[PDB]
Amino acid sequence: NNTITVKTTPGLCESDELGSKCIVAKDGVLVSANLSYWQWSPRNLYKPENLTFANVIAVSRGANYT
Amino acid sequence: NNTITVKTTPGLCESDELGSKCIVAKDGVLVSANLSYWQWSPRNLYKPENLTFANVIAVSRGANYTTLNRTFDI
Amino acid sequence: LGMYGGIAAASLTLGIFGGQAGITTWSLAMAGRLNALGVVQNALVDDVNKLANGFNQLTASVGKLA
Ligand SMILES: *[C@@H]1O[C@H](CO)[C@@H](O[C@@H]2O[C@H](CO)[C@@H](O[C@@H]3O[C@H](CO)[C@@H](O)[C@H](O)[C@@H]3O)[C@H](O)[C@H]2NC(C)=O)[C@H](O)[C@H]1NC(C)=O
Ligand SMILES: *[C@@H]1O[C@H](CO)[C@@H](O[C@@H]2O[C@H](CO)[C@@H](O[C@@H]3O[C@H](CO)[C@@H](O)[C@H](O)[C@@H]3O)[C@H](O)[C@H]2NC(C)=O)[C@H](O)[C@H]1NC(C)=O
Ligand SMILES: *[C@@H]1O[C@H](CO)[C@@H](O[C@@H]2O[C@H](CO)[C@@H](O)[C@H](O)[C@H]2NC(C)=O)[C@H](O)[C@H]1NC(C)=O
Ligand SMILES: *[C@@H]1O[C@H](CO)[C@@H](O[C@@H]2O[C@H](CO)[C@@H](O)[C@H](O)[C@H]2NC(C)=O)[C@H](O)[C@H]1NC(C)=O
Ligand SMILES: *[C@@H]1O[C@H](CO)[C@@H](O[C@@H]2O[C@H](CO)[C@@H](O)[C@H](O)[C@H]2NC(C)=O)[C@H](O)[C@H]1NC(C)=O
Ligand SMILES: *[C@@H]1O[C@H](CO)[C@@H](O)[C@H](O)[C@H]1NC(C)=O
Ligand SMILES: *[C@@H]1O[C@H](CO)[C@@H](O)[C@H](O)[C@H]1NC(C)=O
Ligand SMILES: *[C@@H]1O[C@H](CO)[C@@H](O)[C@H](O)[C@H]1NC(C)=O
Ligand SMILES: *[C@@H]1O[C@H](CO)[C@@H](O)[C@H](O)[C@H]1NC(C)=O
């Protein structure tokens, strides 16, 4: 019915160096509504909440992470 | 052909506290045939075996996992 | 014939409760369906009641089709 336009990214890494700690969203998407920080939403509805353990997944660095 | 009715759960955690060690089944389902412990089966056939390393996957706590209060031994 | 009675009866539950039975209620079945469609991670009682009201209003509007 109503939409919102946010920023999104495939994953988040700490630093630029290869071998950094990276996270991707667990069963959801990383969103940011022009904020200074990142949040978690379901993939088909904007319902944001702050990033937590048991909300993300620790991975290795993929292509074009923020 | 023949069915059986077991208990099932999305995952198993050690304790109630957030940050506990949790496991989910790897390419299968967590089942219990009214036992005191949990086992692994294929998703479309009941063929139980005890929980092992290389049978589960260490994850973080999801919603409505079963708490053991036991510190499982793998 | 009625569709959901009789000798050759159709199943009312087979496409949302699935072929391995055990989900006790329609509220628990609909919460799992909203989770798998990616619109709510963990459906509360207000999320399921909002879906139950929208179902019941639409189904009552069938009796006013011209
Ligand atoms: C979700 O996460 C955001 C991002 O951290 C939270 O907003 C931030 O909250 C902190 C702590 O309340 C704020 O930082 C500092 O607050 C202290 C309070 O003692 C104050 O002295 C400082 O001046 C500073 O403001 C921070 O400003 C705030 N905003 C941002 C953009 O970081 C938010 O509260 C979280 N929402 C939840 C948990 O529901
Ligand atoms: C799959 O896992 C179950 C759960 O652990 C196994 O059953 C349990 O086996 C243990 C060890 O044999 C039993 O515990 C103790 O056995 C000692 C033997 O020295 C005895 O002194 C104690 O009285 C106690 O019984 C335990 O009773 C038994 N049952 C339960 C409900 O825990 C089962 O054997 C495993 N199956 C396999 C590996 O095929
Ligand atoms: C967050 O930022 C984006 C980009 O600045 C905003 O999207 C713009 O919205 C205006 C008005 O709706 C449009 O004219 C622009 O074309 C949009 N930009 C893009 C790239 O689509 C968005 O509205 C911002 N605000 C939020 C989410 O509150
Ligand atoms: C394990 O427990 C369940 C529940 O006590 C058993 O399932 C019941 O089986 C009886 C007879 O088949 C039915 O009348 C009940 O309605 C069933 N309960 C439910 C909730 O479906 C099951 O048979 C037990 N025994 C095993 C797996 O050996
Ligand atoms: C859905 O079913 C419920 C049954 O509990 C209906 O609620 C009752 O409807 C009758 C008929 O008008 C009323 O007399 C009762 O006061 C209602 N009770 C409650 C607790 O609501 C409800 O009307 C039905 N909804 C639709 C849209 O048909
Ligand atoms: C859908 O969005 C419109 C805004 O154009 C709003 O008036 C309406 O109430 C929304 N639908 C529901 C069910 O709230
Ligand atoms: C994604 O990464 C490549 C380098 O691997 C870079 O050239 C490209 O510009 C990046 N994409 C964006 C949108 O910046
Ligand atoms: C299927 O189950 C029936 C029990 O009703 C049994 O008699 C039959 O042998 C089973 N089929 C096979 C191939 O074993
Ligand atoms: C699942 O967890 C919620 C709390 O997050 C709880 O209210 C609910 O009763 C649980 N489900 C069952 C079947 O106990």
Return d(Cα C4, Cα C16) in angstroms, integer.
Answer: 16
Of the candidates C38, C22, C31, C37, the one whose C-alpha atom is nearest the C-alpha of residue C52 is: C31
Task: Give residue B70 CA to ligand 2 midpoint distance, Å.
Answer: 15
CA triple B60-B64-B67, angle to 5 deg: 75
Q: Which helix (H) or strand (E) holds A13?
A: strand A12-13
8 Å CB contact between B72 and B12: yes
B31 beta partners: B8, B39
Instruction: Tell how far CA B16 is from the center of its chain.
Output: 16
DSSP-derived secondary structure for chain B: ------EEES-EESSSSTT--EEEESSSEEEESS-SS-EEE-TTS---EE--TTTEEEE---TTPEE-SS----
Task: Give residue C51 CA to ligand 5 midpoint distance, Å.
Answer: 16
- The resolution, in Å, is 2.4
Q: Contacts of residue B60 in chain A, CB cutoff 8 Å?
A: 26, 53-54
Of the candidates B31, B8, A33, B10, the one whose C-alpha atom is nearest the C-alpha of residue C42 is: B10
Return d(Cα B18, Cα B56) in angstroms, integer.
Answer: 20
- The protein residue with its alpha carbon nearest to ligand 1, atom 34, reads A50
Count of other CB atoms within 10 angstroms of residue B61: 20
Q: Which helix (H) or strand (E) holds C49?
A: helix C45-60
> What is the number of the ligand closest to the CA of C56?
5
Experimental method: cryo-EM
